[PDB]
A paper describes a structure:
In contrast, R-spondins (Rspo1-4) are the sole secreted potentiators of Wnt signalling and have emerged as crucial regulators of stem cell maintenance in vivo and in vitro. At the level of molecular mechanism Rspo proteins potentiate Wnt signalling by alleviating the feedback inhibition effected by the transmembrane E3 ligases ZNRF3 and RNF43. Although necessary, binding of Rspo to the E3 ectodomains is not sufficient to stop ubiquitination of Frizzled and enhance Wnt signalling. This further requires simultaneous binding of Rspo to the large leucine-rich repeat (LRR) containing ectodomain of LGR receptors 4, 5 or 6, which are well established GPCR-like regulators of stem cell function. The ternary complex between Rspo and its two receptors LGR4-6 and ZNRF3/RNF43 is established via extracellular recognition and triggers by an unknown mechanism its rapid internalisation.
To provide insight into recognition of Rspo2 by LGR receptors we crystallised a variant of the hLGR5 ectodomain (from which an unstructured loop had been removed) in complex with the Furin tandem repeat of mRspo2. The crystal structure was solved at 2.2 Å and refined to Rwork and Rfree values of 20.9% and 26.0%. The asymmetric unit contains two copies of the hLGR5ecto–mRspo2Fu1-Fu2 complex, which are essentially identical (r.m.s.d. of 0.5 Å for 559 aligned Cα). At the core of the interface is a hydrophobic interaction site with the hallmark ‘phenylalanine clamp’, in this example F105 and F109 of Rspo2Fu2 pinching A190 of hLGR5. These conserved hydrophobic core interactions are surrounded by more polar interactions which differ in a subtle way from the hLGR5–hRSPO1 interface (not all shown in figures): The side chain of N123 is found to form a hydrogen bond with H76, an interaction that was not previously seen. The salt bridge seen between R144 of LGR5 and D85 of hRSPO1 is replaced with a water-mediated hydrogen bond to the backbone of C78 of mRspo2. We observe the exact same dimeric arrangement with a twofold rotational symmetry in our structure as that seen by Peng et al.. The LGR5–LGR5 interface buries some 900 Å of solvent accessible area. Residues I293, Q294, F295, F301 and Q302 function as hinge regions mediating a domain rotation of 9.6° around an axis approximately perpendicular to the horseshoe fold. The structure described here represents the most tightly curved or concave conformation observed to date for the LGR5 ectodomain.
Residue numbers in the entry:
A (entry chain D), B (entry chain B): 40 to 141
C (entry chain A): 32 to 485, 539 to 543
D (entry chain C): 33 to 485, 539 to 543
Amino acid sequence: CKGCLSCSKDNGCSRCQQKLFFFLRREGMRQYGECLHSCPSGYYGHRAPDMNRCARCRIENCDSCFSKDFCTKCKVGFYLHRGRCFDECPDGFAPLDETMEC
Amino acid sequence: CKGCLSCSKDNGCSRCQQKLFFFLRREGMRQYGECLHSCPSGYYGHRAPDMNRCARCRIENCDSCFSKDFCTKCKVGFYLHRGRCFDECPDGFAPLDETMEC
Amino acid sequence: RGCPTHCHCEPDGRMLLRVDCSDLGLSELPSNLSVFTSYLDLSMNNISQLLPNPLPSLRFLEELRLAGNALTYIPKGAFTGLYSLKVLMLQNNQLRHVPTEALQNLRSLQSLRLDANHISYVPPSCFSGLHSLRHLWLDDNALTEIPVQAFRSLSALQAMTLALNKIHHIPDYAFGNLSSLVVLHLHNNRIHSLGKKCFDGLHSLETLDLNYNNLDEFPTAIRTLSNLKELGFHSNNIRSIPEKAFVGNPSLITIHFYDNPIQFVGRSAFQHLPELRTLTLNGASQITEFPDLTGTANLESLTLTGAQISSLPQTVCNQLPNLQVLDLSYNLLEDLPSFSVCQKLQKIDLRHNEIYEIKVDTFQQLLSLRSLNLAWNKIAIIHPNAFSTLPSLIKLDLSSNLLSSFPITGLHGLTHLKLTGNHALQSLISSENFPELKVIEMPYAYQCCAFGVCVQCSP
Amino acid sequence: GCPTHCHCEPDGRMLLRVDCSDLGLSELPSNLSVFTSYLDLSMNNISQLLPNPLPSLRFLEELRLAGNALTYIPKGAFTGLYSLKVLMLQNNQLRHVPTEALQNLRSLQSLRLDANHISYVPPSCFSGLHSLRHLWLDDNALTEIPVQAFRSLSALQAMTLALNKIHHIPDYAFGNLSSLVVLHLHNNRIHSLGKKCFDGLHSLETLDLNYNNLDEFPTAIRTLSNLKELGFHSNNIRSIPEKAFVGNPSLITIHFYDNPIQFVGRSAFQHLPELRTLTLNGASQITEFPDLTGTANLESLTLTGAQISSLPQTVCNQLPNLQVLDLSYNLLEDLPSFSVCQKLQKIDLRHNEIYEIKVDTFQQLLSLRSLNLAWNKIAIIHPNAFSTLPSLIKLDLSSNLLSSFPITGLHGLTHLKLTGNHALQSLISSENFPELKVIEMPYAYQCCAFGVCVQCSP
Ligand SMILES: *[C@@H]1O[C@H](CO)[C@@H](O)[C@H](O)[C@H]1NC(C)=O
Ligand SMILES: [Cl-]
Ligand SMILES: [Cl-]
Ligand SMILES: [Cl-]
Ligand SMILES: [Cl-]
Ligand SMILES: [Cl-]
Ligand SMILES: [Cl-]
């Protein structure tokens, strides 16, 4: 219940401090709310006046995000190009093996 | 089933001939439709362009009725006046025993 | 063997005889009827003539049923000798006019059923001498006009139906001498026009039914009906209810006028009706003002939708102390008064208006309120204590508003909550500020999951 | 194997992840391994860093300083961090972007400056940041676009300036951000845009102007030829003009709910062959259904609260892929045939003025699950109108003017709603509707007859 304005027993945090991101950690049988400075791997932080939350990366073959349609680091074996992840790095630009990109 | 355009099984009549009244008999578990020329005692017949139906009288202390709010014969021990059933026959006109009317 | 062959018989309360000879395909009457017969049922047979009858000997016969036979014609003397006859049933036969003479002078007759024949003509004096007639059924025939002359006689009549015929006009004084008439049913005719005095003479009338007709104009003729308690003119083509419309009808409990293209309603139209229990207007476009209900304090239900109502008076609940249902969906409401003086309210529907805020006192101390619907407004703020004193509140719909947060206090008893279409409402809400919730519609699915659902939650 | 109280784990077979977050540290720890690829110093009490062991961390790729007490970052703070790809300074007390500490971090790809109190971007604070791809400046005190500083970031692909106080965007504000793919400007106070305020953004696929104060349709998007997603919901725009999206043929998504939209040009939504959804609620001055020529891939169309009184006979020819149609709350009287709309799964025509349903209207809609015709003026339905709707599951004909109701093709229903049809006094029987689980009859006696005095009301 760190970074939390409004805590509880079994649910963890329910409302975060102004500038932090809400994230639902899921152990299985029960789930707890958390207030984070940045979102964990697989998620991106979305700010709004009322609250900020970690939302899931919406992108094929992506491991990390800037936003829901912009990838920042692709799944293994896929090449990063303009925020997207492709098997073959499409014509017009070659792939950088050493770099894992285009 | 009698007087009926649509005889179901596991059931009574579902739609009656044009000028007959539908009435829902309750045998106990199963209920059955019937098609009557006038409605059984405690009910009035209601006619509409494609469905005539026996509706129950819900006038208090009444046994038969013409209409929803017009009684035609009260229960035992009650007096009929303008289609309403009274205990005391209200001032302006007294009871009159031979008929149980006012 | 005290009963005719194939018939079934039973003593009545006075040990006079009830004889059932219905549904035996008889073409002629049975032979050996007891002079002590009080009831004779000859329904559903093939009787087209009553020439050979033993009826003259049935001096105690009170009720005769001839429904569902093939009568086209009833001769002068058919009911001679039935000096006790109270009820005659001739429904569902093939008469094309009311017999000219057979029904005259049946002095003890109280109830006459002529319904479901093909009757197009009521001869001028066919009810002559019916001094005792109380109930008359002429429904489902082919009448094209009120038989004004034939009804001149019947001053003892209490209940009549002319429903399901082809009557197009009711002239002045059409029922002019029916001073005992309590119920008159004219539904399913083709009545377009009513004389301005067409109901004069109906001093005792309590129920008038003009439902399912073709009226273009409000029936001014009811002004005379000072004892009217139930009035029905639904499913017509009426376009306005004028001022002082019900000024002559202070006893009205029930006025039904739905499925009329009503557009305008007069300022005063619904004042001074202390017994009226329900009022319902759906689709009344040109109504810009909430009606004055002075002297009309007993409404349990009020529905006024599809109009141009912009405001309600601050003191509107002073006129609505017994109101249990209020429906003003589909108007232009912006500012709500306080509803607290409407102490009895159980249900409030204010969907599809233009409401922008809920204040602290709008819903205060409505202890019986169960369901409140504010869907499709423009609500951006709800005071945090707006719902503090609604212990009965069970359903709350705030769908499609402009909210950015959601109050807790006073809503622990909710079973139904609806919030979809509030995009800015991104705050969570936790499962035991709302332990009793069973249907939730959230703005986002992550609000469902955080609640503990990923009990019905959408999305 | 690790600074005291910190937590360390291998990152590969050589390098090291060091977690020193949330230890209430006032100063950096002392014995930091040269093997450190990742260092987390978040949630601590560090107000500046001058006594640092950072210069020896030549393999450090990620440094996290979120949620500390930083007001000031001195010029040499990050010298020697040749490998630094990610720098996180969000949730600190900076009031302007450090004037010099951030220049010439040549490896730096991601910089978080969000949730500070930044009111000023010095003109050359980003000089030398040629690797910078992602910049977060969301939730600060910015009052205009720092045009100057942004000329030095032409490799930038993603940026957010959301949750600031920006009120105007001048011509060429982003004019050398030719690589920018995503730009977020939501929750600002933008009230006016230059007619060329987005020129130079050749690569931009996403633009987010939601929750601002625009009075006027941002015609400056016309140069954004690669725009796939546009958002300008929750502004004060009343009109979408003719040829509005003519420069944006790849748009997949355009969101503009919660605007007081009233006009839409005829041509506005033509020639958008990738657009999947169109949604107009409350569009109350609209009198004609918009032309969708060359815009054939809509899966959902919602157009409500308008003055639409008829659809063109041939309207489904432009809606071959439509799955959801919502035209509730209009003035529709006569319906065309929707049979060319083969993919329809839901039709909502509630609160119109529809007077009959013909044989032809809904024929061969094999995927139609749900049809809502509540609150119309329907007095006849053709007996075969629903003959070929094998997927029909929900039918709502509440508050119409019916006096009869078809059986043919409705044995599959689970939901039937008939209340408010006063003339419908005829009986419906459970044999024709074995699948019903929710029923609203015109009268309670009709429920009883059904076998119910599985839910029937009243
Ligand atoms: C009314 O009917 C009664 C009874 O038949 C009769 O005495 C009288 O002449 C009639 N009066 C009028 C005004 O028609
Ligand atoms: Cl999500
Ligand atoms: Cl009933
Ligand atoms: Cl004759
Ligand atoms: Cl309810
Ligand atoms: Cl500085
Ligand atoms: Cl609705």
